[PDB]
Design a binder for this molecule. Structure first.
Ligand SMILES: CCCCCCCCCCCCCCCCCC(=O)OC[C@H](COP(=O)([O-])OCC(O)COP(=O)([O-])OC[C@@H](COC(=O)CCCCCCCCCCCCCCCCC)OC(=O)CCCCCCCCCCCCCCCCC)OC(=O)CCCCCCCCCCCCCCCCC
Ligand SMILES: CCCCCCCC/C=C\CCCCCCCC(=O)O[C@H](COC(=O)CCCCCCC/C=C/CCCCCCCC)COP(=O)(O)OCCN
Ligand code: SF4
Ligand code: SF4
Ligand code: SF4
Ligand code: SF4
Ligand code: FES
Ligand SMILES: [Mg+2]
Ligand SMILES: [Zn+2]
Lengths: 208, 114, 176, 97, 96, 112, 230, 124
């Protein structure tokens, strides 16, 4: 045996691969890619305007009853033309499975709101808008959810500073809390941790 | 190229939306001054609304203008519903920040900032 | 497997109907709750007589920080900055230089106790058992500045608490 | 605990149980605060031979995800993400409360 | 071994002492300066030098797993003592 | 025949077989408007004929629920309705067409 | 003309005389190394760059072995991994437990390559070797118990700085690097032995104990002490 | 779909202050290899970082203070073109440094033992 190595499940890997091929065949218009990670997670990369068709299919189809939306989030990758990557995590209770659907967008391109498919998408898309700046087209009530009232900027973008630009204090002259430019008594000490030696050859990129 | 229009297909429709939002913000300043019990004048509030509208006057992209009017509408509805406090309304005015020097000699005397 | 938490139906015999009617008219379950509260009244309270009685603690407890010494009196800290590296909250500030005898020793060792999250990573990462999180937990101050400890304060804490710190480390060092 | 026989009887009658059997205050039944020293085990990788890290390296066996289908790159039966979940069985210990 | 600056302020084991014209001395008015009296340099100098009859010795600081990482010190230079640099402990070979 | 389905908001159906036959027939009728070569049409037609054959061969409700493996017969009816709605929408969306557009050159490359 | 070799089955066109290490570098693979520097001559004594060829029963020194036509270099094979683990085991077997008091700290090649290419456990149940510390002037601090005898400082001194005052005295496990006499290694290019020494055997004396590599921020500027503009 | 021919500009939407948009010059570069180690894995990607601003010493505790929000902000890009496009759309000034790669070198072990050339080494 190998006590310290995580065991694999080739049966589940095969089942997920088969279902990925199934979905890719059923929806050729939008599905761009299908992957299965080696810890058995199915991932479907679609064109950004197939969000409603693909999600409605994955929710209503008899062989894919993904009735529950576990999560909805975005990832900011500045090096891409479409920096923002919208991620949908679906759970199928009927087949005891989970799926992931991935979409891309940038600052000025809206993504169709999926509140007509899942009701949790309401607050999930409000948070995505608030924290990343992604606009969702037909959203019942799209506004800030987590940031302070009047907060300027979207803090989860990679180019946003960790401590932001303004900070609050109470001013006795005006008898109210005021917003003033940030100024740190001890500046955050940035550590360079990355080792100059390659760790995982299996992910080595071509020299190009 | 052929980019997806968010709300407006041309700059004229974006200008129309900007004018509608300006009318909405202009007609709400008296109510805001009354409800929040601010010590400013209605003229000061309208001048601030014009100034905030006018610092985006250089934008020539209909999509950026659509996003600006979307955010302006959101922050108008925060004011109308009294979700904001007097704190934020007065944060629009920077009444506590010291006057930052703008000439080379004053900046040179003060410190190392460009 | 599963079970139903509320899926039973009442019996409709005349005796059961009369019993339920008596419970409705004569507040039987309400009196039962009264009896439970009275039972608790005649039980013994669980309150300790602080500050003359203290709650139980263990050798693993993480309280106020301290810098230790060798039995010779020499400081254990060698200014290796592993605690500064591992500190989640960035609450440790360290600056070092060669001492007059050439030792690798700290000149500045600060811990912001208002930034510290009392996680104990610094004493896990210390290779010489210099920085420890002692047993003291009653060190509340009246001003914020008094909570920004420096090297003199931490060495004073170590000197004051060394006996108990040594005993706790002796008790718990075989689990580490 | 320390209680008069009358008070214990009244407490038992009021609550309808035997409180002395299940007490919420701890009287000398807990472990001693001083214990003998431990001696913990080592593990499976603490041998002096036949123990090469390359044969027990979990991280280096991670792989990039397998590309099932890519756009860039008989009658098939319809599939499901997994076999349908089996119906749960009602508990034998206590099916109903 | 504490020492007093010409301004009356105690000098710490790092040599810190505010200047005469430094305004920051105001913080100690009606209060005190936190200074630890024991100096590690003085105490470790007070420690004696151990003599062992071997070229290489090992020091773990005392206590085993409760000390510092065990290191080996080469006692070949007859003009100086070998110092364990974790704990500052001096060792030597018997001369003469 | 049964008092409850155990699910809040899901009512017991008195005539499950008739409703299932109606729903499956309607689903098959909607699928006839989809192009024959569409992968969606073949798969859901296959599973609908598979389910429709069972509802016409087993008159016992418990045995039918066992054979369908869809939970309860009310859940099966609800899923048939969801499938019918999806079939109509897919007829509107027409997802059998070739890919709308390829992504940019490195849109899914990771790490990056 | 260029010959064709294979690194892990991938074709590379390399000039004759190119070594295995340089061919792997060409395809983007950096072979572990201690004694090899590309600005110095080739020593081949640390044996850290041993790799497996497809049909060769024996591992070769990648830093000193010219590639032959149609060679397949197995950089991540079992033989290569075990060779690296054995070499790292010997090095760490005699190394001292000085990491917290070592300026090389978070920028040590012994540490990084031990975390990447070595085993995570020690089989050494003996006593370690302790080496007397030499003195070569006010700039470079020598703690020679950490030396791994890679002879980079000797090659650098000689070839680059034209000073032949460094060498190895004795032989066997008791081989030492130094001057054999109390002589100071003073040269206008003396800190580069601080740079090229992979371990904390040679460290900067002005910089001693002041900081750690992760703390520091790096600003890329140029030198103004002379008109070279380094 | 609509056609608009403009340079992308999102400064009005990012919420950055005007001074931190207009007075900032970022440096697009590939990091230089740390000379203390022989690894080359940190020289793969392009970095974007801002110009250094003032840091002073705190009167209490003597810590290092700052008033520059963008002091610790470092962005990672796979290509110079990506980094430049990001800087341009965010409106910062930028200076680009061309990547420096070591030139190929001719290494020969047998050169250590030349019969008539100076490459013969005096020691091993
Ligand atoms: C005043 C009369 C004399 C009283 C005794 C003398 C005490 C000194 C004088 C009183 C001063 C206050 C004393 C408070 C506590 C003293 C210190 C203490 O804790 O000692 C430990 C010691 C307890 O020993 P222990 O080892 O801790 O107990 C074992 C376990 O821990 C626990 O075991 P347990 O859980 O089984 O509990 C044991 C329980 C077991 O007892 C039984 O089973 C006996 C039956 C139940 C108790 C009956 C209580 C009275 C009737 C019910 C009233 C409701 O025993 C008791 O509870 C003792 C009850 C003694 C009652 C004596 C008559 C008092 C009448 C007060 C009536 C007040 C309302 C009416 C209006 C008055 C108007 C003036 O205390 C006693 O034994 C003394 C009795 C404590 C309470 C007395 C309260 C009397 C009233 C206060 C004021 C009196 C002055 C007049 C004022 C007029 C207006 C200004
Ligand atoms: C010879 C012929 C004689 C003819 C007379 C016959 C009368 C004798 C029999 C009838 C007597 C019935 C008792 C009357 C009081 C009944 C009140 C009642 O309606 O019961 C409860 C209502 O009462 C309550 O719920 C009480 C709630 C508040 C309880 C909190 C405090 C009570 C606990 C303290 C105990 C009080 C002890 C009283 C002491 C008095 C000392 C002066 C029913 O309400 P629900 O259960 O919600 O359902 C009704 C609709 N489905
Ligand atoms: S306990 Fe945790 S947060 Fe506190 S100083 Fe130690 S490492 Fe930092
Ligand atoms: S980890 Fe320990 S020895 Fe290292 S700097 Fe911190 S307190 Fe000092
Ligand atoms: S040279 Fe490297 S491995 Fe050796 S003690 Fe120093 S940091 Fe540790
Ligand atoms: S002192 Fe450093 S450079 Fe010289 S041989 Fe030893 S490890 Fe190599
Ligand atoms: S790097 Fe090749 S043997 Fe040292
Ligand atoms: Mg070095
Ligand atoms: Zn020691």
């Amino acid at each position: 045996t190998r006590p310290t190595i995580r065991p694999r499940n080739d049966v589940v890997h095969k089942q997920l691969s088969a279902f990925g091929q199934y979905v890719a065949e059923i929806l050729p218009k939008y599905v761009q890619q299908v992957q299965v990670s080696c810890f058995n997670e199915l991932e479907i990369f679609i064109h950004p305007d197939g969000v409603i068709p693909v999600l409605t299919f994955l929710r209503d189809h008899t062989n894919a009853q993904f009735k529950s939306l576990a999560d909805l989030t975005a990832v900011d990758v500045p090096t891409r033309q479409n920096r923002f990557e919208i991620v949908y995590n679906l759970l199928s209770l009927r087949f005891n499975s989970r799926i992931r659907v991935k979409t891309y967008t940038d600052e000025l391109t809206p993504i169709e709101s999926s509140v007509t498919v899942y009701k949790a998408a309401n607050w999930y898309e409000r948070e995505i808008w608030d924290m990343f700046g992604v606009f969702f087209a037909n959203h019942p009530d799209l506004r800030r959810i987590l940031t302070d009232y009047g907060f300027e900027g979207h803090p989860f973008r990679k180019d946003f500073p960790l401590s932001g630009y303004v900070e609050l204090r109470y001013d006795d002259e005006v008898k109210r809390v005021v917003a003033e430019p940030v100024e740190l008594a001890q500046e955050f000490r940035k550590f360079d941790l990355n080792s100059p030696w390659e760790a995982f050859p299996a992910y080595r990129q071509p020299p190009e | 190229t052929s980019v997806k229009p968010i709300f407006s297909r041309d700059m004229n429709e974006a200008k129309r939306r900007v004018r509608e939002l300006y009318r909405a913000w202009y007609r709400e300043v008296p109510n805001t001054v009354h409800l929040f019990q601010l010590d400013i004048s209605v003229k000061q509030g309208r001048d601030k609304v014009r100034e905030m509208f006018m610092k985006n006057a250089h934008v020539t992209d209909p999509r950026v203008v659509d996003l600006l009017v979307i955010k302006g509408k959101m922050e108008l509805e925060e004011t109308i519903n009294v979700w904001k406090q007097r704190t934020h309304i007065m944060r629009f005015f920077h009444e506590t920040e010291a006057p930052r020097p703008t000439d080379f000699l004053s900046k040179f005397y003060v410190g190392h900032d460009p | 497997t599963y079970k139903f938490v509320n899926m039973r139906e009442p019996s409709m015999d005349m005796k059961s109907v009369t019993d339920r009617a008596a419970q409705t008219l004569l507040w039987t379950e309400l009196v039962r709750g009264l009896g439970m509260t009275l039972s608790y009244l005649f039980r013994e309270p669980a309150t300790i007589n602080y500050p003359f009685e203290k709650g139980p603690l263990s050798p693993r407890f993480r309280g106020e920080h301290a810098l230790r010494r060798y039995p010779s009196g020499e400081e254990r800290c060698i200014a290796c900055k592993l605690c500064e590296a591992v500190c989640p909250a960035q609450a440790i500030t360290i600056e070092a230089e060669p001492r007059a005898d050439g030792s690798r020793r700290t000149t500045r060792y600060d811990i912001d106790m208002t930034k510290c999250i009392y996680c104990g990573f610094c004493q896990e990462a210390c290779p010489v058992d210099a920085i420890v999180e002692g047993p003291n937990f009653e060190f509340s101050t009246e001003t914020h500045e008094e909570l920004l400890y420096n090297k003199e304060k931490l060495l004073n804490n170590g000197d004051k608490w060394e006996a108990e710190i040594a005993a706790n480390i002796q008790a718990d060092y075989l689990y580490r | 605990a320390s209680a008069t026989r009358v008070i214990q009887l009244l407490r038992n009658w009021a609550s309808g149980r035997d409180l002395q059997a299940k007490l919420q205050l701890r009287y000398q039944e807990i472990s001693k605060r001083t214990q003998p020293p431990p001696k913990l085990p080592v593990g499976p990788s603490h041998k002096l031979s036949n123990n090469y890290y390359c044969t027990r390296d979990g991280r280096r066996e991670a792989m990039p995800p397998s590309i099932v289908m890519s756009s860039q790159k008989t009658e098939k039966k319809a599939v499901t993400p997994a076999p349908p979940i089996k119906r749960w069985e009602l508990s034998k210990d206590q099916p109903y409360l | 071994g504490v020492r007093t600056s010409p301004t009356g302020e105690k000098v710490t084991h790092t040599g810190q002492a505010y200047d005469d014209g430094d305004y920051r001395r105001v913080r100690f008015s009606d209060r005190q300066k936190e200074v630890n009296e024991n100096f590690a340099i003085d105490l470790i100098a007070e420690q004696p030098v151990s003599e062992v009859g071997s070229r290489v010795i090992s020091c773990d600081g005392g206590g085993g797993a409760l000390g510092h990482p065990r290191v080996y010190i080469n006692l070949d230079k007859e003009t100086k003592t070998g110092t364990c640099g974790y704990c500052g402990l001096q060792f030597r070979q018997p001369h003469h | 025949l049964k008092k409850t389905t155990g699910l809040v908001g899901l009512a017991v159906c008195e005539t499950p077989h008739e409703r299932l036959k109606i729903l499956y027939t309607k689903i098959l009728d909607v699928l006839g408007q989809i192009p024959k070569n569409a992968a969606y049409r073949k798969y859901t037609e296959q599973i609908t004929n598979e389910k429709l054959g069972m509802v016409k061969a087993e008159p016992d409700v418990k045995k039918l629920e066992e054979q369908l493996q869809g939970g309860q017969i009310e859940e099966v009816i609800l899923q048939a309705e969801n499938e019918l709605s999806l079939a109509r929408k897919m007829l509107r969306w027409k997802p059998w067409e070739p890919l709308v557009e390829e992504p940019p050159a490195n849109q899914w490359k990771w790490p990056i | 003309n260029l010959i064709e070799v294979f690194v892990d089955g991938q074709s590379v066109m390399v000039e004759p005389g190119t070594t295995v290490l340089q061919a792997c570098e060409k395809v983007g693979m950096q072979i572990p190394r201690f004694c090899y520097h590309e600005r110095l001559s080739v020593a081949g004594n640390c044996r850290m760059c041993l790799v497996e060829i497809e049909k060769a029963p024996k591992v070769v020194a990648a830093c000193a072995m010219p590639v032959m036509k149609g060679w397949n270099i197995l950089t991540n094979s079992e033989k290569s991994k075990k060779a690296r683990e054995g070499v790292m085991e010997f090095l760490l077997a005699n190394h001292p437990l000085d990491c917290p008091i070592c300026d090389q700290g978070g920028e040590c090649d012994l540490q990084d390559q031990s975390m990447m290419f070595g085993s995570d456990r020690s089989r050494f149940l003996e006593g370690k070797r302790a080496v007397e510390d030499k003195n070569i002037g006010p700039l470079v601090k020598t703690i020679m118990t950490r030396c791994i005898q890679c002879t980079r400082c000797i090659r650098f001194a000689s070839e680059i700085a034209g000073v032949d005052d460094l060498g190895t005295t004795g032989r066997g496990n008791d081989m030492q690097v130094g001057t054999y006499i109390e002589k100071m290694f003073m040269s206008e290019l003396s800190g580069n032995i601080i740079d090229i020494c992979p371990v904390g055997a040679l460290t900067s004396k002005p910089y001693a104990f002041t900081a750690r590599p992760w703390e520091t921020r790096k600003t890329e500027s140029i030198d103004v002490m002379d008109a070279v503009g380094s | 779909l609509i056609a608009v021919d403009e340079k992308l500009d999102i400064t009005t939407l990012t919420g950055v202050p005007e001074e931190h948009i207009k007075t900032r010059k970022v440096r697009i570069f590939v990091p230089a290899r740390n000379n203390m180690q022989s690894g080359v894995n940190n020289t793969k990607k392009w970095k974007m970082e801002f110009d250094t601003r003032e840091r002073w010493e705190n009167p209490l505790m003597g810590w290092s203070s700052t008033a520059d929000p963008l002091s610790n902000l470092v962005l990672t890009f796979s290509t110079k073109e990506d980094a430049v496009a990001f800087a341009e759309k965010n409106g910062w000034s930028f200076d680009v440094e061309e990547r420096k790669v070591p030139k190929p070198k001719s290494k020969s072990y047998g050169a250590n033992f030349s019969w008539n050339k100076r490459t013969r080494v005096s020691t091993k």
